[PDB]
């Protein structure tokens, strides 16, 4: 099982959109996938996946033994092979324990999940640290913007020193850059950091580039991840990303105008 | 001194943009203002205010007595009356500590202490609203952001120092941000009114989606300083309203 954390540091760059679209895309390709909301007290993954009303038990319920993984997992209705573990709604920072999260991830491997997508919250404090701690890979989600690039760099420092793999001299977390809300026209008028500017700063492998797309607002309005909209450019770029995660090369679209 | 927290729950809605534009606008109007970055381990306010390289000591340095408020405050160079207290960079913020800092700032005669809150409802965000007299709930016309703003209203009413002591409650204002009237009329975006019917609080500003905001952070120059930017003008309107002057809402129809 590949445990993939979708992280960023900066808030509102597209972690939820990406965690949802990518988990769905992987499911579509026949890979049994669960996407877990690691937020503390804010439930946004269920809202984007469109299952906000089937949420009975959540991640922290399972950790405190008030529910089984089976009781808390929500099987997506629209896409076969896809499951969602939603976030707790308590303000308690403790709630998510390292031992607790580990136990849940082992249960999921035992249930035969190939991909465990961890939708991280913003920050570098508790919920975000917990989402990357057991990761085998990290999708660093970034906008061509100054705050986001600075905060992604900080997150790279954490991936390299506070993850379980780093703290034990194991093979390090495999890192990928998901450059999101890109706008080639803005780049050429000199108003927006280009894809290459961002790579020269955060020096990691590009795994996708998601164009700014009016389809993404319409997708969350309906609770339908944007990869399911076969006309959306952001959807197509996410389906490319999924191919690259599965090992297939794909040319990068939507980087020139 | 009015302590104003800029809050949201949801990440990336415009808290930093709004905290910077509004602190600046207030300073421009001759009100001595400090804007404080309450983030834990991420420094974003200094980047948007353009003083990332003058940062020697930060908010947590002052709380742990490694520096004085005078050593950590950065006086803005471009706008008179404006000061920035930047965020710590450790992975600290105590209630007693933050209270001591806020009293020192009142004693230094600051009229407005703008608290630039982080995302979430955990530690840094709770600390930024706890001592507030007002809250600017920053919201996009989007489903995650409206849901998370509602949660933040619940906390403002129960976990703030005013709520926990039956004092006059925190005065709350909605700052609707990244609005797009054209998107609203094509039926693709929650309207200003949809958002008011749900989070039932007083509107204090509406900031349009504006390509000027990316250009402003690129330069480290708050968007209110760009006198041609619609987002800038809407933030100057907001500042007027905070100071008690009515102003008609622009950029809500197309």
């Amino acid at each position: 099982a590949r445990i993939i954390v979708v992280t960023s540091g900066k808030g509102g760059v597209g972690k939820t959109t990406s965690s949802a679209a990518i988990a769905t895309g992987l499911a579509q390709k026949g890979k049994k996938t669960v996407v877990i909301d690691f937020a503390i007290g804010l439930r946004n993954l269920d809202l984007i996946m469109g299952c906000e009303r089937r949420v009975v038990y959540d991640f922290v319920n399972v950790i405190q033994g008030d529910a089984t993984l089976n009781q808390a997992l929500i099987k997506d209705k629209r896409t076969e092979n896809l499951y969602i573990l939603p976030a707790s709604q308590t303000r308690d920072k403790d709630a998510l324990t390292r031992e607790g999260v580990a136990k849940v991830l082992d249960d999921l491997k035992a249930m035969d999940f190939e991909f465990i997508v961890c939708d991280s919250p913003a920050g570098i404090e508790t919920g975000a640290l917990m989402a990357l701690y057991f990761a085998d890979e990290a999708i660093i989600t970034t906008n061509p913007e100054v705050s986001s690039v600075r905060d992604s760099d900080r997150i790279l420092g954490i991936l390299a020193s506070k993850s379980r793999r780093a703290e034990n001299g194991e093979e390090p977390i495999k890192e990928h850059l998901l450059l999101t809300r890109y706008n080639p026209g803005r780049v050429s008028r000199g108003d927006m950091l280009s894809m290459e500017d961002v790579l020269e700063i955060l020096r990691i492998k590009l795994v996708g580039v998601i164009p700014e797309d009016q389809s993404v607002l319409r997708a969350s309005n309906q609770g339908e991840p944007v990869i399911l909209d076969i006309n959306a450019d952001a959807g197509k770029a996410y389906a490319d990303t999924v191919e690259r995660l599965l090992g297939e090369e794909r040319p990068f679209r939507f980087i020139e105008e | 001194a009015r302590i104003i927290v800029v809050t949201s729950g949801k990440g990336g809605v415009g808290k930093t943009t709004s905290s910077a534009a509004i602190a600046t606008g207030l300073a421009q109007k001759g009100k001595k203002t400090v804007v404080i970055d309450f983030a834990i381990g991420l420094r974003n306010l200094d980047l948007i205010m353009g003083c990332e390289r003058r940062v020697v000591y930060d908010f947590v340095n002052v709380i742990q007595g490694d520096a004085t408020l005078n050593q950590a405050l950065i006086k803005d160079k471009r706008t008179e009356n404006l000061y920035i207290l930047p965020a710590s960079q450790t992975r600290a913020l105590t209630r007693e500590g933050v209270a001591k800092v806020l009293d020192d700032l009142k004693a230094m005669d600051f009229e407005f202490i703008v608290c630039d809150s982080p995302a979430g409802i955990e530690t840094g965000a709770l600390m930024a609203l706890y001592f507030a007299d007002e809250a600017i709930i920053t919201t996009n016309p989007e489903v995650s952001s409206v849901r998370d703003s509602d949660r933040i209203l619940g906390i403002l009413a129960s976990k703030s120092r005013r709520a926990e002591n039956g004092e006059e409650p925190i005065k709350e204002h909605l700052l609707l941000t990244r609005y797009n009237p054209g998107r609203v009329s094509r039926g693709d975006m929650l309207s200003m009114e949809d958002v008011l019917e749900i989070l039932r609080i007083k509107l204090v500003g509406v900031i349009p989606e504006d390509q000027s905001v990316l250009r402003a952070s690129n330069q480290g120059e708050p968007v209110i300083l760009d006198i041609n930017a619609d987002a800038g003008k809407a933030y100057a309107d907001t500042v007027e309203r905070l100071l008690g002057e009515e102003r008609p809402f622009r950029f809500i129809e197309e």
């Binding site: - | 849901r147 039926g187 749900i198």
Partner: peptide
Amino acid sequence: NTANIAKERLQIIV
């Protein structure tokens, strides 16, 4: 018209 769907889904939660 997805703004209307968004608004109904929102009211049920809040």
